[PDB]
Amino acid sequence: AASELKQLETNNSPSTALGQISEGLTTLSHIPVLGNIFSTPAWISAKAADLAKLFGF
């Protein structure tokens, strides 16, 4: 979520990169799995800065 909100600001669009001609693109064999790049929320960490905020400081 945090990651997506950030990218949305930098590119001012959900799209992360430059386009590709559609004639040469295939994702027919692609099989998505539950664990990915956006599956882990940023609040799950123990870095000093994060823990202080977690306890209300």
Partner: protein, 282 residues
Amino acid sequence: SKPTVQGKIGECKLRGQGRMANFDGMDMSHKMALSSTNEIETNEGLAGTSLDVMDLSRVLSIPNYWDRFTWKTSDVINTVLWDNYVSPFKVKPYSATITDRFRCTHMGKVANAFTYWRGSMVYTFKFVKTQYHSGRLRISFIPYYYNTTISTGTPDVSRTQKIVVDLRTSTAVSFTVPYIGSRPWLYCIRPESSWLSKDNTDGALMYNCVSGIVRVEVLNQLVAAQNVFSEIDVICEVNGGPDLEFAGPTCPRYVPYAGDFTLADTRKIEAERTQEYSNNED
């Protein structure tokens, strides 16, 4: 923790909408598509060609028929066979009887919705004749001369730029008429418009929208064999040069018309339509 704000206070102008009348910038529409990113792809070949046909130069340069005139064996030297106003505003009455409906060309369709025009015009003449017809013509461009009514005297042929063509075997003559004016632009206005007359002289002010005239005069009388029709029908085609441009886009003045003209034109249309879309006869 949830700290209290202490930073910058911005200044903002709210918009009920943005860039509505402009061609560039940004549009604030909500998207009805599932994706807030919906956008179809564009490439060469979509409709048969690699070129972009929305570019005005692709439209203005299409050769269009416009008028015709006759050249007879009895027209004496110096007879003016045809005059034409140098301007892209090619919009005229359907005929001598129907003056509330009009014909046009691609240049006129565009001019009919713009404020200014610049550039050259291409003129093409097609002499529908025989190889047994012979005569010489004088064809020229006369900057800032319009007609005997609003212009002083007659043009001095000696000071006029021109081409003298010997027509015997040839059948086509073609050339480009370059932009000539005191300002970088001229106005887009029909020559016949009534707001151009000044002292009971129709079109007296057209020198603010027309650069002059193209003229065809007889030099050596046309002669023809006794076994060929003694007249030549001359087709006149016109289109824009590479530098023909316009500047102030607005609302069109005249608009597309799908109604009728004459009882005889409608019968012809019906006969052709029957031939074009029948399964038998209708």
